[PDB]
């Protein structure tokens, strides 16, 4: 029982674009751009669509860098998150109803205002490693269990 999600990190050589989530689950934290994959679109299509809906940006290409499965205690569906990177943005990011985009220098990532699991996997993404992750949460603050490794194929 899982549901496909996307997450896109716009990672340029000395900075990364994150969006302050303004509403829904995880509001108040800086996230990458993404959401649920819809009937009738590929995972990469859905990643592109959400990046455009949430920041205005389009891209030349996305690169698959990770997969993360989230379990929330008491929730029947696992989140199957397909994580992509890009450094070919077209446009200037703009605020949407859902996200307030801001650039962060790579030594000033706002980890204390991010999901706690980010402290584990986001560095792998920054190191250009591909990864598979699993995090079991109780609520939004507590990681009960996790697994994390690098992989050759996502
Ligand atoms: C480095 C940027 N990191 C994230 O953007 C990020 C999002 C996220 C998360 N949620 C759950 C609710 O739907 C949105 C998202 C898939 C749960 C746990 N860790 C997360 N990290």
Query: Per the annotation, does 35 bind a ligand?
Result: yes
- Which method resolved this structure? X-ray
- How many angstroms is it from 115 CA to the middle of ligand 1? 6
Residue environment code for 84-96, b if the CB has 16+ CB neighbours within 10 A, otherwise e: bbbeebeeebeeb
Placement of tokens 């703009």 in the chain: 94
Q: CA 18 from chain center: how many Å? A: 9
Q: What are phi and psi of 78, to 5 degrees?
A: -70, 150
Q: In this structure, are residues 18 and 108 in contact, taking their beta carbons and an 8 Å threshold?
A: no
- How many angstroms is it from 92 CA to the middle of ligand 1? 23
Q: What is the best residue among 2, 3, 4, 7 to mutate for testing ligand 1's pocket, by most ligand atoms within 8 Å of CB?
A: 7
Tokens of 90: 């077209």
Question: Residues near ligand 1 with C-beta < 6 Å?
Answer: 5, 7, 25-26, 31-32, 70, 79, 81, 115, 117-118, 122
Query: Per the annotation, does 26 bind a ligand?
Result: no
Tokens of 99: 């996200």
Domains of the chain with CATH codes: 1-154 (3.90.79.10)
Long-range pairs of 28-34 with CB within 8 A, sequence gap ≥ 24: 28/113, 29/113, 29/114, 29/115, 30/102, 30/104, 30/110, 30/113, 30/114, 31/7, 31/99, 31/114, 31/115, 32/7, 32/8, 32/83, 33/7, 33/8, 33/99, 34/5, 34/6, 34/7, 34/8, 34/81
* Residue 109 Cα: closest atom of ligand 1: 1
Residue 132 CA to residue 12 CA, distance in Å, equals 22
Q: What is the widest separation between alpha-carbon atoms in the chain? A: 40
Q: In this structure, are residues 16 and 24 in contact, taking their beta carbons and an 8 Å threshold?
A: no
If one counts every other C-beta atom within 10 angstroms of the C-beta of residue 138, the result is 13
Residue closest to 64 by CA, chosen among 18, 6, 122: 6
Residue 46 CA to residue 48 CA, distance in Å, equals 5
- How many angstroms is it from 34 CA to the middle of ligand 1? 9
């Amino acid at each position: 029982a899982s549901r496909l999600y996307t997450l896109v990190l716009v990672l340029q050589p000395q900075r990364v674009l994150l969006g302050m989530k303004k509403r829904g689950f995880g509001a108040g934290r800086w996230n990458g751009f993404g959401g649920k994959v819809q009937e009738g679109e590929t995972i990469e299509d859905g990643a592109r669509r959400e990046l455009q809906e949430e920041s205005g940006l389009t891209v030349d290409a996305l690169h698959k860098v990770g997969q993360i499965v989230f379990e929330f205690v008491g929730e029947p569906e696992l989140m199957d998150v397909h994580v992509f990177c890009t450094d070919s943005i077209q446009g200037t990011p703009v605020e949407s109803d859902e996200m307030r985009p801001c650039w962060f220098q790579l030594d000033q990532i706002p980890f204390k205002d991010m999901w706690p699991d980010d402290s584990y996997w986001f560095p792998l993404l920054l190191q250009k490693k591909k990864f598979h992750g699993y995090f079991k949460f109780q609520g939004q603050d507590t990681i009960l269990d996790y697994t994390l490794r690098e992989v050759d194929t996502v």
